[PDB]
Paper text:
The second principal receptor for IgE, CD23, is a type II transmembrane glycoprotein with a C-type lectin-like domain (CTLD)4 (3, 4). In its membrane-bound form, CD23 consists of three CTLD “heads” connected to the membrane via a trimeric α-helical coiled-coil “stalk”. The interaction between CD23 and IgE is critical in the regulation of IgE synthesis, which can be up- or down-regulated depending on the oligomerization state of CD23 (2, 9, 10). We have determined the crystal structures of the human lectin-like head domain of CD23 in its Ca2+-free and Ca2+-bound forms, as well as the crystal structure of the Ca2+-bound head domain of CD23 in complex with a subfragment of IgE-Fc consisting of the dimer of Cϵ3 and Cϵ4 domains (Fcϵ3-4).
As predicted from the crystal structure, the introduction of the S252A mutation did not affect Ca2+ binding, but unexpectedly, the D258A mutant was unable to bind Ca2+ even though the aspartate forms part of the apparently nonfunctioning auxiliary Ca2+-binding site. D258A (auxiliary) and D270A (principal site) crystallized differently, and in all eight and seven molecules within the asymmetric unit, respectively, Pro-250 is trans. Mutation of Asp-258, which faces Pro-250 at the base of loop 4, to alanine results in a conformational change in loop 4 and a reorientation of Arg-253 compared with the Ca2+-free derCD23 structure; this was seen in all eight molecules within the asymmetric unit. The side chain of Arg-253 flips ∼180° and projects into the principal Ca2+-binding site cavity, occupying the Ca2+ ion position. The re-positioned Arg-253 side chain forms two salt bridges with the carboxylate group of Glu-249. Occupation of the Ca2+-binding site by Arg-253 explains why the D258A mutant fails to bind Ca2+. However, the crystal structure of this mutant, in contrast to the other three structures that all showed perturbations only at the site of mutation, revealed that the D258A mutation (at the base of loop 4) caused a major reorientation of Arg-253 such that its guanidinium group occupied the principal Ca2+-binding site.
Residue numbers in the entry: 158 to 292
Amino acid sequence: FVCNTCPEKWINFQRKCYYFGKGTKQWVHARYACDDMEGQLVSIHSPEEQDFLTKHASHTGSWIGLRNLDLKGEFIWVDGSHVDYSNWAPGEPTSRSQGEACVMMRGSGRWNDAFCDRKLGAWVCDRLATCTPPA
């Protein structure tokens, strides 16, 4: 069981593929853009995964798959999974009480809560890597 094959223009890390996309998008349109590529906005679940993303991240910032779902107060990844790993900037997301709901990744890799209608130049998609057959 060796799964590290990724489509063209995707970078592998462990058992996932990652797409570092470009072009100005609001969070909801970045979300559609990943769905359109048979993926989804990235979910982050370890220090190791964050390291990898931080290395390939855009300095101008980028959308990730975490949002304050239906403004209920709890942050959930687009794939349905809960927050275990977190890499918040200092004070975040408590200092964000003016209606910020969508989470972006800075150049430093740190997460900050943003207004969902903010237009960012970058956004990250993920998906499972495919495996080479028992050959």
